[PDB]
Amino acid sequence: GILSSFKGVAKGVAKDLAGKLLETLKCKITGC
Numbered sequence: 350g351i352l353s354s355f356k357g358v359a360k361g362v363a364k365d366l367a368g369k370l371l372e373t374l375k376c377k378i379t380g381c
Contacts, residue, residue, distance in 0.1 A: 368381040375381060
């Protein structure tokens, strides 16, 4: 389903988006 894919992944996008694009520094800082 689309909703399944979104709620599975999109639900935590607010923080994790930065985790991906800024992996070089957010994940090092926050510990993603």
